[PDB]
Design a binder for this molecule. Sequence first.
Ligand code: FAD
Length: 241
Amino acid sequence: SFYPLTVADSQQISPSLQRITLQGDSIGHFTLENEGDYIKLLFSEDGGTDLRQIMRTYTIRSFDATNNRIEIDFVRHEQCGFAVRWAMHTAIGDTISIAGPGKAQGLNPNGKWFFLAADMTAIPALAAQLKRLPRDAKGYAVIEIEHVDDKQALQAPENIEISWVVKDSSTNLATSVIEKNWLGENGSVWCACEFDTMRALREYFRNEKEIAKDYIYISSYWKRGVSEDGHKQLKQTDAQT
Ligand SMILES: Cc1cc2nc3c(=O)[nH]c(=O)nc-3n(C[C@H](O)[C@H](O)[C@H](O)COP(=O)(O)OP(=O)(O)OC[C@H]3O[C@@H](n4cnc5c(N)ncnc54)[C@H](O)[C@@H]3O)c2cc1C
Protein backbone atom coordinates (compact mmCIF):
# COMPACT_ATOMS: atom_id res chain seq x y z
CA SER A 1 0.00 0.00 0.00
CA PHE A 2 1.24 3.43 -1.06
CA TYR A 3 -0.49 6.62 0.02
CA PRO A 4 -0.29 9.77 -2.16
CA LEU A 5 0.21 13.03 -0.26
CA THR A 6 0.69 16.74 -0.94
CA VAL A 7 3.24 19.10 0.59
CA ALA A 8 1.23 21.45 2.79
CA ASP A 9 4.07 23.26 4.58
CA SER A 10 7.87 23.39 4.68
CA GLN A 11 9.76 25.26 7.40
CA GLN A 12 13.41 25.52 8.36
CA ILE A 13 13.16 24.94 12.10
CA SER A 14 16.87 25.13 12.92
CA PRO A 15 20.17 24.93 11.03
CA SER A 16 20.02 21.16 10.68
CA LEU A 17 16.26 20.59 10.35
CA GLN A 18 13.60 21.12 7.71
CA ARG A 19 10.08 20.18 8.88
CA ILE A 20 7.78 19.17 6.02
CA THR A 21 4.05 18.69 6.44
CA LEU A 22 2.33 16.21 4.13
CA GLN A 23 -1.45 16.07 3.79
CA GLY A 24 -4.10 13.89 2.26
CA ASP A 25 -7.21 11.84 2.80
CA SER A 26 -5.17 8.78 1.82
CA ILE A 27 -3.81 8.80 5.42
CA GLY A 28 -7.12 9.59 7.15
CA HIS A 29 -7.03 6.12 8.69
CA PHE A 30 -3.91 7.02 10.70
CA THR A 31 -4.23 7.84 14.39
CA LEU A 32 -1.92 9.42 16.93
CA GLU A 33 -0.69 5.89 17.71
CA ASN A 34 1.21 6.15 14.41
CA GLU A 35 3.42 8.92 15.79
CA GLY A 36 6.92 7.49 15.98
CA ASP A 37 6.21 4.82 13.37
CA TYR A 38 8.49 4.76 10.33
CA ILE A 39 7.30 5.33 6.76
CA LYS A 40 9.06 5.08 3.41
CA LEU A 41 9.24 7.98 1.00
CA LEU A 42 9.02 6.71 -2.57
CA PHE A 43 11.18 7.94 -5.45
CA SER A 44 11.87 6.86 -8.96
CA GLU A 45 15.47 6.23 -9.91
CA ASP A 46 15.66 9.69 -11.49
CA GLY A 47 15.03 11.21 -8.06
CA GLY A 48 11.50 12.41 -8.78
CA THR A 49 8.38 11.40 -6.88
CA ASP A 50 6.21 10.70 -9.93
CA LEU A 51 6.04 6.91 -9.90
CA ARG A 52 12.93 0.24 -9.81
CA GLN A 53 11.83 2.26 -6.77
CA ILE A 54 14.19 4.08 -4.40
CA MET A 55 12.83 4.28 -0.83
CA ARG A 56 13.93 6.34 2.16
CA THR A 57 12.96 5.74 5.78
CA TYR A 58 11.60 8.59 7.92
CA THR A 59 9.65 8.89 11.16
CA ILE A 60 6.13 10.28 11.60
CA ARG A 61 6.95 13.17 13.91
CA SER A 62 3.27 14.06 14.43
CA PHE A 63 -0.15 13.26 13.03
CA ASP A 64 -2.93 15.86 12.90
CA ALA A 65 -6.24 14.01 13.23
CA THR A 66 -8.29 17.03 12.14
CA ASN A 67 -6.89 17.62 8.65
CA ASN A 68 -4.95 14.41 7.95
CA ARG A 69 -1.40 15.73 8.06
CA ILE A 70 1.93 14.28 9.10
CA GLU A 71 5.06 16.21 9.97
CA ILE A 72 8.42 14.75 8.92
CA ASP A 73 11.68 16.20 10.22
CA PHE A 74 14.49 16.02 7.65
CA VAL A 75 18.09 16.41 8.70
CA ARG A 76 19.59 18.98 6.30
CA HIS A 77 22.68 16.89 5.54
CA GLU A 78 25.26 17.31 2.76
CA GLN A 79 26.80 11.24 -3.42
CA CYS A 80 23.67 13.35 -3.22
CA GLY A 81 20.82 11.99 -1.14
CA PHE A 82 17.39 11.46 -2.68
CA ALA A 83 15.26 12.46 0.29
CA VAL A 84 17.26 15.47 1.48
CA ARG A 85 17.52 16.80 -2.09
CA TRP A 86 13.77 16.44 -2.53
CA ALA A 87 13.02 18.02 0.85
CA MET A 88 15.17 21.09 0.28
CA HIS A 89 13.78 21.74 -3.22
CA THR A 90 10.13 20.81 -2.78
CA ALA A 91 7.48 23.50 -2.96
CA ILE A 92 4.11 23.54 -1.25
CA GLY A 93 1.69 21.83 -3.62
CA ASP A 94 4.17 19.18 -4.76
CA THR A 95 3.27 15.51 -4.28
CA ILE A 96 4.96 12.40 -2.89
CA SER A 97 3.75 8.91 -2.02
CA ILE A 98 4.62 6.95 1.12
CA ALA A 99 4.60 3.32 2.23
CA GLY A 100 4.19 1.96 5.77
CA PRO A 101 3.74 2.84 8.56
CA GLY A 102 5.62 0.18 10.47
CA LYS A 103 6.85 -0.15 14.02
CA ALA A 104 10.16 -1.07 15.69
CA GLN A 105 11.08 -2.48 19.10
CA GLY A 106 10.41 0.06 21.82
CA LEU A 107 11.91 0.95 25.17
CA ASN A 108 11.07 -1.84 27.64
CA PRO A 109 8.65 -0.21 30.14
CA ASN A 110 9.73 -2.60 32.91
CA GLY A 111 13.06 -0.90 33.50
CA LYS A 112 13.56 0.72 36.89
CA TRP A 113 15.29 3.59 35.09
CA PHE A 114 15.70 4.56 31.46
CA PHE A 115 18.57 5.58 29.19
CA LEU A 116 17.61 7.04 25.81
CA ALA A 117 20.13 8.20 23.22
CA ALA A 118 19.68 9.73 19.79
CA ASP A 119 21.34 11.69 17.04
CA MET A 120 19.33 14.11 14.93
CA THR A 121 17.84 11.42 12.69
CA ALA A 122 16.25 9.86 15.77
CA ILE A 123 14.81 12.90 17.61
CA PRO A 124 11.24 12.31 16.33
CA ALA A 125 11.42 8.65 17.37
CA LEU A 126 12.94 9.57 20.74
CA ALA A 127 10.16 12.10 21.33
CA ALA A 128 7.56 9.37 20.80
CA GLN A 129 9.36 7.13 23.31
CA LEU A 130 9.41 9.93 25.89
CA LYS A 131 5.69 10.48 25.48
CA ARG A 132 4.99 6.81 26.21
CA LEU A 133 6.95 6.70 29.46
CA PRO A 134 5.05 7.05 32.77
CA ARG A 135 5.29 10.52 34.26
CA ASP A 136 7.41 9.23 37.19
CA ALA A 137 10.09 7.67 34.97
CA LYS A 138 13.71 8.43 35.85
CA GLY A 139 16.95 8.39 33.90
CA TYR A 140 18.56 10.13 30.94
CA ALA A 141 17.95 11.23 27.38
CA VAL A 142 21.18 12.23 25.59
CA ILE A 143 20.80 13.84 22.16
CA GLU A 144 23.51 14.78 19.67
CA ILE A 145 22.96 17.83 17.48
CA GLU A 146 25.17 19.57 14.92
CA HIS A 147 24.46 23.16 16.04
CA VAL A 148 23.38 24.65 19.37
CA ASP A 149 20.33 26.17 17.66
CA ASP A 150 19.08 22.62 16.89
CA LYS A 151 17.90 22.10 20.48
CA GLN A 152 14.16 21.43 20.76
CA ALA A 153 11.66 21.63 23.59
CA LEU A 154 10.88 17.98 24.26
CA GLN A 155 8.06 16.82 26.50
CA ALA A 156 9.47 14.31 28.94
CA PRO A 157 8.89 12.96 32.43
CA GLU A 158 10.33 15.40 34.93
CA ASN A 159 13.01 12.98 36.19
CA ILE A 160 14.31 12.09 32.73
CA GLU A 161 17.33 14.38 32.51
CA ILE A 162 17.67 15.64 28.94
CA SER A 163 21.15 16.62 27.76
CA TRP A 164 22.01 18.07 24.37
CA VAL A 165 25.51 17.53 23.00
CA VAL A 166 26.82 19.60 20.11
CA LYS A 167 29.10 17.43 18.00
CA ASP A 168 32.65 18.64 17.42
CA SER A 169 36.11 17.10 17.21
CA SER A 170 36.06 16.24 20.94
CA THR A 171 32.33 15.95 21.68
CA ASN A 172 29.96 13.25 20.41
CA LEU A 173 27.05 11.01 21.32
CA ALA A 174 29.12 7.95 22.24
CA THR A 175 31.45 9.84 24.58
CA SER A 176 28.59 11.74 26.20
CA VAL A 177 26.53 8.60 26.80
CA ILE A 178 29.46 6.76 28.38
CA GLU A 179 30.19 9.78 30.62
CA LYS A 180 26.77 9.68 32.30
CA ASN A 181 26.78 8.29 35.82
CA TRP A 182 25.59 4.70 35.68
CA LEU A 183 22.44 4.28 37.79
CA GLY A 184 22.79 0.54 38.37
CA GLU A 185 20.99 -2.67 37.47
CA ASN A 186 17.57 -2.91 35.85
CA GLY A 187 18.02 -0.13 33.32
CA SER A 188 16.13 -0.08 30.04
CA VAL A 189 17.84 1.38 26.98
CA TRP A 190 16.68 2.91 23.69
CA CYS A 191 19.29 4.18 21.23
CA ALA A 192 19.07 5.13 17.55
CA CYS A 193 21.98 6.86 15.88
CA GLU A 194 24.77 6.55 13.31
CA PHE A 195 26.12 3.04 12.68
CA ASP A 196 29.53 3.35 14.38
CA THR A 197 28.06 5.07 17.43
CA MET A 198 25.53 2.24 17.53
CA ARG A 199 28.32 -0.36 17.49
CA ALA A 200 30.30 1.31 20.27
CA LEU A 201 27.26 1.86 22.48
CA ARG A 202 25.97 -1.67 21.87
CA GLU A 203 29.24 -2.98 23.31
CA TYR A 204 28.97 -0.55 26.24
CA PHE A 205 25.39 -1.40 27.16
CA ARG A 206 25.25 -5.13 26.39
CA ASN A 207 28.72 -6.21 27.48
CA GLU A 208 30.27 -3.65 29.83
CA LYS A 209 26.98 -2.85 31.60
CA GLU A 210 25.39 -6.30 31.12
CA ILE A 211 21.98 -5.13 29.85
CA ALA A 212 19.97 -8.12 28.64
CA LYS A 213 18.73 -8.11 25.06
CA ASP A 214 15.09 -7.55 25.98
CA TYR A 215 16.05 -4.41 27.97
CA ILE A 216 17.80 -2.67 25.07
CA TYR A 217 16.69 -1.45 21.66
CA ILE A 218 19.74 -0.21 19.81
CA SER A 219 19.67 0.46 16.09
CA SER A 220 21.55 2.24 13.34
CA TYR A 221 19.50 4.80 11.42
CA TRP A 222 22.28 5.61 8.89
CA LYS A 223 25.96 5.07 8.09
CA ARG A 224 28.16 8.02 7.19
CA GLY A 225 29.31 7.81 3.58
CA VAL A 226 26.78 5.12 2.61
CA SER A 227 23.27 5.61 1.23
CA GLU A 228 20.19 3.92 2.65
CA ASP A 229 20.32 1.19 0.00
CA GLY A 230 23.79 0.24 1.22
CA HIS A 231 22.91 0.77 4.89
CA LYS A 232 20.20 -1.87 4.76
CA GLN A 233 22.82 -4.29 3.42
CA LEU A 234 25.32 -3.25 6.12
CA LYS A 235 22.70 -4.04 8.73
CA GLN A 236 22.49 -7.61 7.40
CA THR A 237 26.29 -7.89 7.46
CA ASP A 238 26.38 -6.59 11.05
CA ALA A 239 23.65 -9.05 12.10
CA GLN A 240 25.75 -11.99 10.88
CA THR A 241 27.92 -11.05 13.86
C1 FAD B 1 13.55 3.72 11.35
C2 FAD B 1 14.25 4.93 10.78
C3 FAD B 1 13.69 6.20 10.94
C4 FAD B 1 14.33 7.34 10.46
N1 FAD B 1 13.74 8.59 10.65
C5 FAD B 1 14.38 9.65 10.22
C6 FAD B 1 13.75 10.94 10.37
O1 FAD B 1 12.60 11.12 10.76
N2 FAD B 1 14.52 12.00 9.93
C7 FAD B 1 15.78 11.91 9.36
O2 FAD B 1 16.37 12.94 9.02
N3 FAD B 1 16.33 10.68 9.17
C8 FAD B 1 15.67 9.62 9.58
N4 FAD B 1 16.23 8.38 9.37
C9 FAD B 1 17.51 8.33 8.65
C10 FAD B 1 17.35 8.37 7.14
O3 FAD B 1 16.73 7.18 6.65
C11 FAD B 1 18.73 8.45 6.50
O4 FAD B 1 19.34 9.63 7.01
C12 FAD B 1 18.73 8.44 4.97
O5 FAD B 1 20.04 8.05 4.55
C13 FAD B 1 18.41 9.79 4.36
O6 FAD B 1 18.18 9.56 2.96
P1 FAD B 1 18.78 10.50 1.81
O7 FAD B 1 18.14 10.09 0.56
O8 FAD B 1 18.74 11.93 2.18
O9 FAD B 1 20.32 10.11 1.74
P2 FAD B 1 21.00 8.77 1.15
O10 FAD B 1 20.81 8.75 -0.31
O11 FAD B 1 20.52 7.60 1.93
O12 FAD B 1 22.55 8.99 1.52
C14 FAD B 1 23.35 9.91 0.75
C15 FAD B 1 24.54 10.33 1.59
O13 FAD B 1 24.07 11.14 2.70
C16 FAD B 1 24.60 10.64 3.90
N5 FAD B 1 23.63 10.88 4.96
C17 FAD B 1 22.39 10.31 5.12
N6 FAD B 1 21.76 10.68 6.20
C18 FAD B 1 22.64 11.58 6.80
C19 FAD B 1 22.56 12.34 7.98
N7 FAD B 1 21.49 12.38 8.77
N8 FAD B 1 23.64 13.08 8.31
C20 FAD B 1 24.70 13.09 7.49
N9 FAD B 1 24.86 12.44 6.34
C21 FAD B 1 23.80 11.70 6.05
C22 FAD B 1 24.84 9.16 3.65
O14 FAD B 1 25.77 8.68 4.63
C23 FAD B 1 25.35 9.19 2.20
O15 FAD B 1 26.75 9.43 2.19
C24 FAD B 1 15.57 7.20 9.80
C25 FAD B 1 16.12 5.94 9.62
C26 FAD B 1 15.48 4.80 10.10
C27 FAD B 1 16.10 3.45 9.88
